[PDB]
Design a protein around this ligand. Structure first.
Ligand SMILES: *[C@@H]1O[C@H](CO)[C@@H](O[C@@H]2O[C@H](CO)[C@@H](O[C@@H]3O[C@H](CO[C@H]4O[C@H](CO)[C@@H](O)[C@H](O)[C@@H]4O[C@@H]4O[C@H](CO)[C@@H](O)[C@H](O)[C@H]4NC(C)=O)[C@@H](O)[C@H](O[C@H]4O[C@H](CO)[C@@H](O)[C@H](O)[C@@H]4O)[C@@H]3O)[C@H](O)[C@H]2NC(C)=O)[C@H](O)[C@H]1NC(C)=O
Ligand SMILES: *[C@@H]1O[C@H](CO)[C@@H](O[C@@H]2O[C@H](CO)[C@@H](O[C@@H]3O[C@H](CO[C@H]4O[C@H](CO)[C@@H](O)[C@H](O)[C@@H]4O[C@@H]4O[C@H](CO)[C@@H](O)[C@H](O)[C@H]4NC(C)=O)[C@@H](O)[C@H](O[C@H]4O[C@H](CO)[C@@H](O)[C@H](O)[C@@H]4O)[C@@H]3O)[C@H](O)[C@H]2NC(C)=O)[C@H](O)[C@H]1NC(C)=O
Ligand SMILES: *[C@@H]1O[C@H](CO)[C@@H](O[C@@H]2O[C@H](CO)[C@@H](O[C@@H]3O[C@H](CO[C@H]4O[C@H](CO)[C@@H](O)[C@H](O)[C@@H]4O[C@@H]4O[C@H](CO)[C@@H](O)[C@H](O)[C@H]4NC(C)=O)[C@@H](O)[C@H](O[C@H]4O[C@H](CO)[C@@H](O)[C@H](O)[C@@H]4O)[C@@H]3O)[C@H](O)[C@H]2NC(C)=O)[C@H](O)[C@H]1NC(C)=O
Ligand SMILES: CC1(C)CN(C(=O)[C@@]23C[C@@H]4C[C@@](c5ccccc5)(C[C@H](C2)/C4=C\Cc2ccccc2)C3)CC[C@H]1N
Ligand SMILES: CC1(C)CN(C(=O)[C@@]23C[C@@H]4C[C@@](c5ccccc5)(C[C@H](C2)/C4=C\Cc2ccccc2)C3)CC[C@H]1N
Ligand SMILES: CC1(C)CN(C(=O)[C@@]23C[C@@H]4C[C@@](c5ccccc5)(C[C@H](C2)/C4=C\Cc2ccccc2)C3)CC[C@H]1N
Ligand SMILES: *[C@@H]1O[C@H](CO)[C@@H](O)[C@H](O)[C@H]1NC(C)=O
Ligand SMILES: *[C@@H]1O[C@H](CO)[C@@H](O)[C@H](O)[C@H]1NC(C)=O
Ligand SMILES: *[C@@H]1O[C@H](CO)[C@@H](O)[C@H](O)[C@H]1NC(C)=O
Ligand SMILES: *[C@@H]1O[C@H](CO)[C@@H](O)[C@H](O)[C@H]1NC(C)=O
Ligand SMILES: *[C@@H]1O[C@H](CO)[C@@H](O)[C@H](O)[C@H]1NC(C)=O
Ligand SMILES: *[C@@H]1O[C@H](CO)[C@@H](O)[C@H](O)[C@H]1NC(C)=O
Ligand SMILES: *[C@@H]1O[C@H](CO)[C@@H](O)[C@H](O)[C@H]1NC(C)=O
Ligand SMILES: *[C@@H]1O[C@H](CO)[C@@H](O)[C@H](O)[C@H]1NC(C)=O
Ligand SMILES: *[C@@H]1O[C@H](CO)[C@@H](O)[C@H](O)[C@H]1NC(C)=O
Ligand SMILES: *[C@@H]1O[C@H](CO)[C@@H](O)[C@H](O)[C@H]1NC(C)=O
Ligand SMILES: *[C@@H]1O[C@H](CO)[C@@H](O)[C@H](O)[C@H]1NC(C)=O
Ligand SMILES: *[C@@H]1O[C@H](CO)[C@@H](O)[C@H](O)[C@H]1NC(C)=O
Lengths: 236, 127, 127, 236, 127, 236
């Protein structure tokens, strides 16, 4: 049942479990590989508003982990600290030996609150949360993951920069979620789906250098009026 | 079965990490006390879409998910590490799990090099 | 070794549950978020005592216990999932762990279909 | 050493590890099956007094778990909440991923106290406690199990209702244990070995409908004066 | 590759413990409730340096460490129990992972006993 | 990569992964064995001062465990209870199912303090800490281990006394560590590398029988002025 990818006739194929190819040679378990591919590479929207609508809370389903040996450098990863309004944690601490996804250009660190109507947070399309060579069906607290899927291969016989982007959220995991991009602990920008990581980092740097940070003790919020990655108040 | 990428996009280039197996490290770097931290054990590579393999792989991973999720639902094991070993066992059982009938389609025994041994031995015996 | 049920009673009918492997579910039921809870992943069946197999199975399970307990006493693994994979490996090693001597009792290689290939090739060469 | 069951000559047999049958065909690991059979099906008494005398406490022996893939619908399962008289727990919480046995017509939920002279509770005849596709050598707190044993098979190549029955116990795990069947929090029936689940449920329903429940704040206890499942005061 | 003990000393005698596999115990000692505690499950033996095997073994263990540490660095599994099963699988794949070409150096199929069957059948057919 | 030992021509050898010996017969997984050999047997110094300089603290490296099936009776094992000067534990509790090394003539139980500049204690030469049929890369609190290394073998087809020796330590894990051998809770002997276990036990027994124990409430410390195992104040 679990498909196994094999190269035949200069093309990748799924191996026929009911047909035996004696020409296929498996001379060691080293020729077998489990690999993780990022949803990013299929063209899904990666902005935090769009991404978080792919995840949802559910009770009654025990979480499951499967390992994989090789992964894809990610443009977008996510790291979630979500509480209920009463302060209790919505996500479980990462189990022993589960570390963050190891290659992330941007880590979208989302902190905030939602009702969390379920014991674990699952991927609504059935994808996995890819961590460090472990793929889980659920999201762990404060642990960086990339969304992705796993494949199994039989092989033929013969620097790194990361930037954390911080967000506050209310009504997390619902239809009516609100996201603020965090400039400092008192300066925020209303988040829109169209904002790219690059735009958010420049927005931050121009707010710092034009003195648009809060200089009261109160919260300042800004609004803004005005292709895949590999290819209040107001302002303008 | 052929693999038909049916995704809205395909990133044709695969910038990957994994771990170096085996290693054969320099000096004492293999000693846990002296070696890299968790962040420093990775190698990287870059693969392009020769033979369509990257876009094919993205679609293969997509289509594997249903069977892999159904397998995870039915196991009581918290973390599954044994899928590839079991596939390798099933590979061997498919070929060698029963009597191998030589010249039979499910028997991966090539008798040709020995057929020529017997035939050259018979031509000699006849002559 | 034959199996002699030696229990005070035998329930001759086996009303069982297990998990459906593989599944091939309907729609999105394979997605963990949408699929059954832990209580709803089971299938059921009913087997009767044809060939004495149910009463035999009850006695087999009874007699397996001593060896299985001794195996569990000696492992340091908290939860053992690998017994069937290891049995499958031992199955293969029993047959293929050494040189296969054709026509030898421990070599599961049937040369018959090819014997007729050589003999028909020799009758032709003689004629 | 671990026996493997195989069908030969229209009968189940134990496979001879010292004899090779080339005719036996194992074409995938799917043909191998680990299965759990219930002690019930061999004719053991399943009443709570008789069943609990099969279990005992022991220190020095690490617990062990083995998985199994298919089980038998149980008529009788048990679920234990036992404390010492000083309030400390006698049984360990179920480890992560160990759930109750999934098919139980009657769950005998026994609450009470005993001396618990040992770190874990084991089966005195060497059987296992069958949970959800995990068989353990020991009993977990508050976790439904059936007593049973495990077999391993090589296969040939080619609704659900549950009722919980509650009991109180003193001197659990000793020669002199006392069991009360619980009608409500203040009404109990002295438990005897001969009482079947069906009898206990009718006893309960006729106590409710004849007003024999306690109507004080104190504990009312009743006494009663007057084949396998598949085939104080007084009253009469 | 030959094993060259290069240690400052070698204890030539190996006083060892392990677990008895299988067991076949006396009476009810196999029952966890009645059997030995963790301290009492061990057997012992004593092996001397016949064929240099003890000093060789000490050096083998020493030289295994680098590859074994590099393997442990790259696994995400907390406790590894599968090394010997995987070696047994690799043993089988080395011999049976492809088509077995009879009389070929990588094919462990001995046709000799059957060569004499065909040759005695041919001498009879010629006579 | 991981070497496998095999007997050829009346000598142990490492199996050539690139060369196939059809004569080698592996007829069951029982012929494969993982084994642990003690550093002791290679001639390393086993006195506590020399042994503890082989171990060091390191952060950033996840600990790893591998099993082994047979071990060597040890002359020397160690059991460590090390705290920082502020009282916090330097070593993690033994994980579930990790017990002490099972055969130790002498258990050197070292209690005391050091700076512990790292999350786990590793072997500086890359050896393992051998416990009960589990080899770890790190030291667990209060858990008896022998230093050793692991080998893997393919086999050919065809009483117990333990004595605990107690020590106090300051500056553990540094260049300037101080060790006291403990006679009772108030009587100690300055520890030197040359002191054997046998000498320490006789030193203890002659201090007890000559009245050299402390008879104040204060700490008494003594100083002493004056081949492999298988082959203040002052005193003399
Ligand atoms: C393997 O690859 C597949 C292909 O990429 C992945 O398929 C994806 O599967 C999910 C279901 O799990 C789908 O989600 C649904 O989307 C519906 C509408 O989305 C369409 O339009 C949006 C525009 O916002 C666009 O982004 C999508 O790409 C999608 O495309 C069109 O969809 C329509 C069907 O409506 C189809 O006729 C068109 O042909 C197609 N266009 C194409 C192919 O060019 C929503 O209405 C759905 O929401 C309902 O159902 C949900 C439960 O499933 C529920 O949560 C909601 O509340 C609501 O009731 C649903 O969200 C993706 O669209 C789909 N993507 C594609 C490209 O087909 C697959 O997930 C992947 N597997 C894994 C494991 O990753
Ligand atoms: C696999 O199947 C086997 C067969 O069903 C199971 O065997 C069972 O094993 C246990 C031991 O672990 C035995 O328990 C002992 O029972 C003795 C007396 O019981 C006899 O009488 C009672 C009546 O109350 C009856 O229920 C039993 O069925 C049993 O039958 C008779 O037993 C006698 C021997 O005494 C025999 O000669 C008869 O032939 C036999 N009748 C038949 C066969 O028709 C008790 O005295 C024992 O208690 C002592 O020993 C205990 C330690 O072992 C200790 O705790 C006690 O304090 C006391 O010192 C003991 O309880 C079962 O009788 C036995 N059942 C049968 C039918 O033989 C086996 O357990 C099973 N394996 C697994 C893993 O489940
Ligand atoms: C497999 O077997 C190998 C052989 O037994 C083990 O090798 C051991 O490896 C460690 C490194 O991990 C070495 O430790 C170093 O020792 C240096 C000096 O020690 C020499 O002298 C002492 C006297 O006190 C003696 O006990 C040793 O036996 C050793 O012998 C001599 O060493 C010199 C090299 O300096 C060599 O030229 C001689 O030929 C040799 N004599 C012989 C062979 O007869 C220290 O200077 C080192 O310290 C530095 O480096 C450390 C990091 O590595 C660092 O912590 C220090 O602060 C300092 O910077 C270092 O401690 C052992 O000497 C070596 N043993 C032998 C006999 O060679 C190997 O470990 C083992 N594998 C496993 C996994 O157990
Ligand atoms: C130690 C190693 C690095 C182990 N290796 C590998 O991990 C791989 C094996 C395979 C797939 C890789 C991959 C897939 C998905 C996600 C991340 C990585 C890329 C490339 C190297 C490759 C290429 C072949 C291929 C076949 C079929 C489809 C696509 C690619 C990982 C092989 C080489 C060896 N040096
Ligand atoms: C996905 C599956 C359900 C997997 N299967 C099974 O789990 C089994 C395989 C085997 C034993 C079963 C069993 C034994 C003990 C306790 C509980 C269940 C009953 C029956 C189906 C069967 C019958 C054969 C038999 C052989 C020898 C003795 C007794 C019975 C489980 C096979 C069919 C497939 N659809
Ligand atoms: C159940 C058993 C006890 C399992 N066995 C064993 O565990 C062994 C297998 C092998 C290695 C042993 C060992 C090595 C290192 C550390 C501790 C022990 C000693 C001896 C028995 C042996 C001897 C052969 C050898 C080959 C190559 C080098 C050195 C020795 C363990 C085999 C016999 C069986 N009764
Ligand atoms: C969620 O989103 C919109 C309104 O914002 C609507 O379609 C849907 O009914 C809402 N559901 C709830 C429960 O508010
Ligand atoms: C901002 O807030 C976080 C938590 O609320 C705190 O840890 C951090 O130190 C703060 N930074 C400054 C500059 O106050
Ligand atoms: C925002 O800009 C300031 C000033 O350059 C910088 O210190 C800060 O790290 C920036 N934040 C992000 C998320 O890059
Ligand atoms: C203080 O804050 C106000 C409003 O955010 C802004 O107009 C002003 O530039 C800030 N001060 C400085 C010195 O920039
Ligand atoms: C347990 O049961 C009976 C008395 O009730 C007797 O045979 C046995 O000695 C008792 N043992 C103890 C310790 O009370
Ligand atoms: C009966 O007692 C239990 C625990 O003692 C309690 O949880 C339950 O609510 C009680 N039921 C009633 C009706 O008081
Ligand atoms: C006992 O009878 C009452 C009344 O019918 C019912 O509510 C209760 O659940 C019964 N108890 C059991 C264990 O069936
Ligand atoms: C009150 O309790 C008594 C004794 O249990 C019983 O005789 C009587 O029937 C009860 N009351 C009612 C109304 O049934
Ligand atoms: C440790 O040991 C000696 C002095 O005792 C010296 O060689 C070395 O520099 C010392 N290092 C530190 C950090 O004290
Ligand atoms: C010695 O001290 C330890 C701990 O400090 C304590 O457990 C032990 O009882 C003491 N022994 C005596 C004889 O006081
Ligand atoms: C030291 O000697 C005393 C008296 O003989 C004895 O009780 C004690 O156990 C000895 N200590 C050790 C470590 O042997
Ligand atoms: C008391 O202690 C002193 C010094 O440790 C020692 O000289 C004397 O012998 C001790 N008392 C006895 C009775 O031995």
């Amino acid at each position: 049942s679990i498909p196994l990818g094999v190269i035949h006739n200069s093309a990748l194929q799924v191996s026929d479990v009911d047909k035996l190819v004696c020409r296929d040679k498996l001379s060691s378990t080293n020729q077998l590989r489990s690999v993780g591919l990022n949803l990013e590479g299929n063209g899904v929207a990666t902005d935090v508003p769009s991404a978080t609508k792919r995840w949802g809370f559910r009770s009654g389903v025990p979480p499951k982990v499967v390992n994989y040996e090789a992964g894809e450098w990610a443009e977008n990863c996510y790291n979630l600290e979500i509480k209920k309004p009463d302060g209790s944690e919505c996500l479980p601490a990462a189990p022993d030996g589960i570390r963050g996804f190891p290659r992330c250009r941007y880590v979208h660190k989302v902190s905030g609150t939602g009702p969390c109507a379920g014991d674990f947070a699952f991927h609504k399309e059935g994808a996995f949360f890819l961590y460090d060579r472990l793929a889980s069906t659920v999201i762990y607290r404060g642990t960086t993951f990339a969304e992705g899927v796993v494949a199994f291969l039989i092989l033929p016989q013969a620097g790194y920069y990361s930037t954390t982007i911080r967000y506050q959220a209310t009504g997390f995991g619902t239809n009516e979620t609100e996201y603020l991009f965090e400039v400092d602990n008192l300066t925020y920008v209303q988040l829109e789906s169209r904002f790219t990581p690059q735009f958010l980092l420049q927005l931050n740097e121009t707010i710092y250098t034009s003195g648009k940070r809060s200089n009261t003790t109160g919260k300042l919020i800004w609004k803004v009026n005005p292709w895949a990655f590999w290819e209040x108040x107001x302002x303008x | 079965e052929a693999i038909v990428n049916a995704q809205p996009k395909c990133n044709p280039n695969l910038h990957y990490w994994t771990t170096q197996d085996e290693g054969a490290a320099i000096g004492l770097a293999w000693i846990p006390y002296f070696g890299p931290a968790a962040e420093g054990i990775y190698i990287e590579g870059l693969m392009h879409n020769q033979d369509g393999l990257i876009c094919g792989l993205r679609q293969l991973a997509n289509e594997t998910t249903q069977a892999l999720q159904l397998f995870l639902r039915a196991t009581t094991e918290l973390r599954t590490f044994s899928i590839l070993n079991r596939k390798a066992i099933d590979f061997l059982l498919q070929r060698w799990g029963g009597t191998c009938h030589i010249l039979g389609p499910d028997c991966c025994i090539e008798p040709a090099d020995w057929t020529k041994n017997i035939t050259d031995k018979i031509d000699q015996i006849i002559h």
